[PDB]
Amino acid sequence: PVDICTAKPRDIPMNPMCIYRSPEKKPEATNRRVWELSKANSRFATTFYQHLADSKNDNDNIFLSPLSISTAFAMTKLGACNDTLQQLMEVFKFDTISEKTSDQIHFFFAKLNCRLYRKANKASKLVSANRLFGDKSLTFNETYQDISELVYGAKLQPLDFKENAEQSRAAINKWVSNKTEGRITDVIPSEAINELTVLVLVNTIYFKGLWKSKFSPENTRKELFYKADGESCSASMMYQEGKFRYRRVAEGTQVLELPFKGDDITMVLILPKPEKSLAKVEKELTPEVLQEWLDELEEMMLCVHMPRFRIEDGFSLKEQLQDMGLVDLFSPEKSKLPGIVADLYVSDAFHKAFLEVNEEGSEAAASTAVVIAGRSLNPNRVCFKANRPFLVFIREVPLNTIIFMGRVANPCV
Amino acid sequence: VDICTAKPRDIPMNPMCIYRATNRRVWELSKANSRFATTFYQHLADSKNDNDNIFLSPLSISTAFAMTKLGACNDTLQQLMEVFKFDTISETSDQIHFFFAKLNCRLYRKANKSSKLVSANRLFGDKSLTFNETYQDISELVYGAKLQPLDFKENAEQSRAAINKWVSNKTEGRITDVIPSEAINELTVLVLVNTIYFKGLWKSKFSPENTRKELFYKADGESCSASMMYQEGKFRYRRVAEGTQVLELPFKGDDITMVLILPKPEKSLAKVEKELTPEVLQEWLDELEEMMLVVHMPRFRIEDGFSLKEQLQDMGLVDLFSPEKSKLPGIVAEGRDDLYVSDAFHKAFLEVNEEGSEAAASTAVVIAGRSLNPNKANRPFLVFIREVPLNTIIFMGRVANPC
Numbered sequence: 046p047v048d049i050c051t052a053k054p055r056d057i058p059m060n061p062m063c064i065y066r067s068p069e070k071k072p073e074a075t076n077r078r079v080w081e082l083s084k085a086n087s088r089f090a091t092t093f094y095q096h097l098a099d100s101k102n103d104n105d106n107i108f109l110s111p112l113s114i115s116t117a118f119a120m121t122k123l124g125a126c127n128d129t130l131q132q133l134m135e136v137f138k139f140d141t142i143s144e145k146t147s148d149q150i151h152f153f154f155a156k157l158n159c160r161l162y163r164k165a166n167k168a169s170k171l172v173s174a175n176r177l178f179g180d181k182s183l184t185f186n187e188t189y190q191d192i193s194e195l196v197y198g199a200k201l202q203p204l205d206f207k208e209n210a211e212q213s214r215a216a217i218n219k220w221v222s223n224k225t226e227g228r229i230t231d232v233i234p235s236e237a238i239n240e241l242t243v244l245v246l247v248n249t250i251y252f253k254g255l256w257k258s259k260f261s262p263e264n265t266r267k268e269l270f271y272k273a274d275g276e277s278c279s280a281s282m283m284y285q286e287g288k289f290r291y292r293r294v295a296e297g298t299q300v301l302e303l304p305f306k307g308d309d310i311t312m313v314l315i316l317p318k319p320e321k322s323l324a325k326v327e328k329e330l331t332p333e334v335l336q337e338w339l340d341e342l343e344e345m346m347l348c349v350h351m352p353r354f355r356i357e358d359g360f361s362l363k364e365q366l367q368d369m370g371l372v373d374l375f376s377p378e379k380s381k382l383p384g385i386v387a388d389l390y391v392s393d394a395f396h397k398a399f400l401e402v403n404e405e406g407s408e409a410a411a412s413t414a415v416v417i418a419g420r421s422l423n424p425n426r427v428c429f430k431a432n433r434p435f436l437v438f439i440r441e442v443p444l445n446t447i448i449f450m451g452r453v454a455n456p457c458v
Numbered sequence: 459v460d461i462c463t464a465k466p467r468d469i470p471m472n473p474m475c476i477y478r479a480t481n482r483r484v485w486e487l488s489k490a491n492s493r494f495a496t497t498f499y500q501h502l503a504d505s506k507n508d509n510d511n512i513f514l515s516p517l518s519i520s521t522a523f524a525m526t527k528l529g530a531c532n533d534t535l536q537q538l539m540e541v542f543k544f545d546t547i548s549e550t551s552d553q554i555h556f557f558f559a560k561l562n563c564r565l566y567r568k569a570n571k572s573s574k575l576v577s578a579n580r581l582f583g584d585k586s587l588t589f590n591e592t593y594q595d596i597s598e599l600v601y602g603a604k605l606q607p608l609d610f611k612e613n614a615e616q617s618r619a620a621i622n623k624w625v626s627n628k629t630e631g632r633i634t635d636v637i638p639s640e641a642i643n644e645l646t647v648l649v650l651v652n653t654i655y656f657k658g659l660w661k662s663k664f665s666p667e668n669t670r671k672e673l674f675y676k677a678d679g680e681s682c683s684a685s686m687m688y689q690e691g692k693f694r695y696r697r698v699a700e701g702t703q704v705l706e707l708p709f710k711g712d713d714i715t716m717v718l719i720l721p722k723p724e725k726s727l728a729k730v731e732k733e734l735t736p737e738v739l740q741e742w743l744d745e746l747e748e749m750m751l752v753v754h755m756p757r758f759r760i761e762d763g764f765s766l767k768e769q770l771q772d773m774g775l776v777d778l779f780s781p782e783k784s785k786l787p788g789i790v791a792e793g794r795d796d797l798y799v800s801d802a803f804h805k806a807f808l809e810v811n812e813e814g815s816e817a818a819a820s821t822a823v824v825i826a827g828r829s830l831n832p833n834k835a836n837r838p839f840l841v842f843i844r845e846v847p848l849n850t851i852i853f854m855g856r857v858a859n860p861c
């Protein structure tokens with residue numbers, strides 16, 4: 046047979062002439078390769094997140110799936126070469142995994158992807174909506190497709206851009222929307238794709254989950270949420286008391302982990318103290334700093350106030366991505382995707398992320414009351430009130446993977 | 459031949475004294491009992507600290523005093539009727555005992571539900587006294603309480619232990635000292651005793667895998683550990699006035715359910731208890747709508763014991779306790795007819811775990827013994843173990859400390 050979970054480096058053609066070799070640099074029961082990749086992948090998430098945050102206004106929420114983008118450009122990378130391939134490695138930090146080969150990266154995703162989407166449990170409803178779209182006139186390589194299928198679970202789909210340019214756009218949106226249980230409707234904006242369109246990269250991940258420790262709607266109370274602009278608005282502040290992996294870090298910033306049923310996927314909230322600013326924290330937050338904060342998360346009983354929120358971000362990666370160094374892939378001239386063709390470059394890359402958080406969890410709203418008999422909490426107990434902007438992440442703990450990462454700078458409606 | 463199957467005018471039951479289908483009375487009885495239950499509970503809490511643990515079988519007390527009533531006469535008989543609210547059952551004194559007997563039948567007599575709810579009533583009289591044949595017969599008829607002789611005159615203490623051991627045997631050792639030492643003395647004539655034992659399986663049991671050790675904070679700043687059980691499922695529930703939560707956890711068979719009452723954390727039982735009445739506890743039950751919810755309740759056990767004298771006197775039962783005014787002539791034929799209740803003791807037990815719940819209780823009315831001078835945490839929650847079809851409160855209390 047040979048599926049994603051049995052794939053061995055031997056089951057992934059190297060393709061000489063097209064292999065990069067990133068420089069050198071001189072805890073588990075968990076797979077090391079997955080460990081290394083997740084670190085390289087989180088390295089890109091925080092980088093990308095920072096650039097993206099800087100380009101945005103503080104009062105704007107944000108939400109994306111860096112794992113998505115990262116995986117999307119990884120399958121694109123599958124058939125990239127030379128200049129194009131290098132930028133792909135360096136931009137997405139895959140080149141930060143010591144002496145690793147552009148070929149091995151794909152083997153790592155094999156391992157990662159195998160566990161993220163297959164070996165996972167029922168509760169870990171994780172759907173990968175990443176596909177490559179190119180015009181029919183182009184002849185695509187079947188070795189690429191076959192590997193892109195095995196590893197990334199998706200082949201490049203040919204669409205009639207030249208002719209049915211607009212008909213294609215709707216074909217794409219119809220497909221992303223299918224996998225995203227309808228949540229990720231439009232994926233490519235209007236007049237985004239046209240006759241000149243050659244290659245289009247779309248990427249999203251869909252997660253559906255229930256809190257392991259639900260909030261009771263009965264305890265939700267409209268509260269003020271202070272924004273960046275110094276103003277205030279009313280949000281539906283959820284409230285509960287429970288045991289959560291928590292941790293007060295540098296300068297009073299609070300890190301809270303709220304797991305979902307399944308236990309492997311959790312939402313981490315980062316709330317700086319009223320004084321310090323989220324922007325200040327977004328800046329200071331680095332891969333190792335974030336990795337550290339998470340390693341220090343210790344179970345603790347606390348009072349949690351959390352605004353109910355909904356965030357939906359529409360991304361056109363191309364700009365920021367090339368602004369970050371990925372220039373060739375988007376270049377009709379400098380581009381080089383020899384493995385994907387049988388002048389091929391990426392026209393644009395679209396990303397859409399969606400998060401709705403309520404008392405039952407992320408995605409759902411099936412009311413549930415909560416009765417806690419015979420509980421007496423310390424009248425001094427530590428509280429976590431998120432009535433000011435805070436970061437958010439959805440990560441697969443065992444895989445040390447950041448699936449989604451966002452910012453809730455305004456939850457109010 | 460049988461009090462349960464028999465009928466009013468068909469059974470030869472009719473006490474010495476007296477004072478002013480049938481299921482209307484049986485139901486009026488249960489309401490009287492519940493009314494006594496809630497009233498008595500209030501007086502009981504009223505004398506304790508708002509944060510003291512409290513558990514008891516009000517049904518058990520009513521039964522023991524109903525028994526005592528059989529030999530009561532005049533003022534004492536009237537007071538007994540009024541205090542235990544038997545004076546609200548449209549019917550005379552003698553009558554009551556029939557319905558009560560009917561009630562106990564529809565309560566403890568059944569081979570249905572693994573909802574073990576038994577009860578044993580027994581009399582313990584002085585080995586040398588001559589008890590009234592009629593009293594002794596109605597007692598054994600209506601309440602199934604047989605008279606066991608004991609030497610209170612000479613060797614009393616061994617007798618007090620004799621009784622306590624009998625209650626123990628009747629409640630799976632759960633109640634081990636219903637009667638305090640030194641209460642029964644040489645001049646102790648008789649001891650009326652009731653016992654109730656419950657043991658049910660959660661209709662929707664809790665899994666130990668989900669139970670977790672949590673820290674409880676005693677009001678005094680101190681803190682201890684409390685094993686908390688957890689589970690999600692459909693339950694009749696409701697958040698009432700001032701934010702009080704009422705949860706009904708039925709036992710297998712749905713005939714007996716435990717009703718929890720938790721006031722919003724930023725409030726206390728105080729208001730709830732002072733406003734507690736049968737009608738109220740019923741309104742809440744009538745608001746209970748099934749709902750999907752998460753239940754977090756301590757796997758614990760509490761025991762309580764006490765004298766029913768002070769509070770029962772406060773409630774208006776004074777004569778029965780007055781060595782002078784007490785009137786219990788229908789008890790001893792030859793020996794004495796100056797009997798009075800020295801003291802009334804009660805002891806209840808409640809244990810709750812993943813499997814289910816176990817409650818026991820006993821009440822010991824002591825005739826002419828010694829009136830032994832009346833010999834904790836926070837975030838408490840009320841508990842009731844009721845018999846739904848019969849509308850009776852079997853057990854009830856305030857769990858203030860699950861540690």
Ligand SMILES: *[C@@H]1O[C@H](CO)[C@@H](O[C@@H]2O[C@H](CO)[C@@H](O[C@H]3O[C@H](CO)[C@@H](O)[C@H](O)[C@@H]3O)[C@H](O)[C@H]2NC(C)=O)[C@H](O)[C@H]1NC(C)=O
Nearest residue numbers: 058059060061063184185186187188189383384385386387
């Ligand atoms: C699609 O991509 C294919 C892989 O990148 C590519 O085929 C590759 O062709 C080269 C030579 O043209 C082979 O490289 C050398 O090794 C093989 C192995 O035995 C020899 O047979 C060759 O002669 C050569 O020395 C690659 O092995 C081969 N890749 C594989 C394993 O399939 C195609 O050219 C591209 N186009 C399509 C759709 O065929």
Ligand SMILES: *[C@@H]1O[C@H](CO)[C@@H](O[C@@H]2O[C@H](CO)[C@@H](O)[C@H](O)[C@H]2NC(C)=O)[C@H](O)[C@H]1NC(C)=O
Nearest residue numbers: 472473474475589590591592593788790791792
């Ligand atoms: C024992 O008690 C019974 C009643 O419990 C007594 O029986 C009769 O009770 C009626 C009450 O209406 C009196 O009018 C009778 O005089 C009582 N005796 C008769 C003639 O039946 C009985 O007196 C008591 N006897 C003992 C054992 O002391």
Ligand SMILES: *[C@H]1O[C@H](CO)[C@@H](O[C@@H]2O[C@H](CO)[C@@H](O)[C@H](O)[C@H]2NC(C)=O)[C@H](O)[C@H]1NC(C)=O
Nearest residue numbers: 061062063125126127128129380381382383384
């Ligand atoms: C990118 O450029 C490199 C080198 O400039 C290409 O790889 C080698 O190119 C030289 C010059 O044509 C050849 O002599 C080698 O045989 C090539 N590789 C090998 C087999 O050693 C590379 O192919 C270019 N990228 C593509 C495929 O467009």
Ligand SMILES: *[C@@H]1O[C@H](CO)[C@@H](O)[C@H](O)[C@H]1NC(C)=O
Nearest residue numbers: 219220222223224225226227
């Ligand atoms: C998406 O299409 C698949 C068939 O390939 C179907 O099973 C699934 O239910 C569809 N999603 C929606 C909109 O339910």
Ligand SMILES: *[C@@H]1O[C@H](CO)[C@@H](O)[C@H](O)[C@H]1NC(C)=O
Nearest residue numbers: 474475476477531532533785
């Ligand atoms: C008590 O009741 C009896 C009849 O039950 C009656 O003869 C007597 O007058 C009453 N008074 C007292 C205090 O004995």
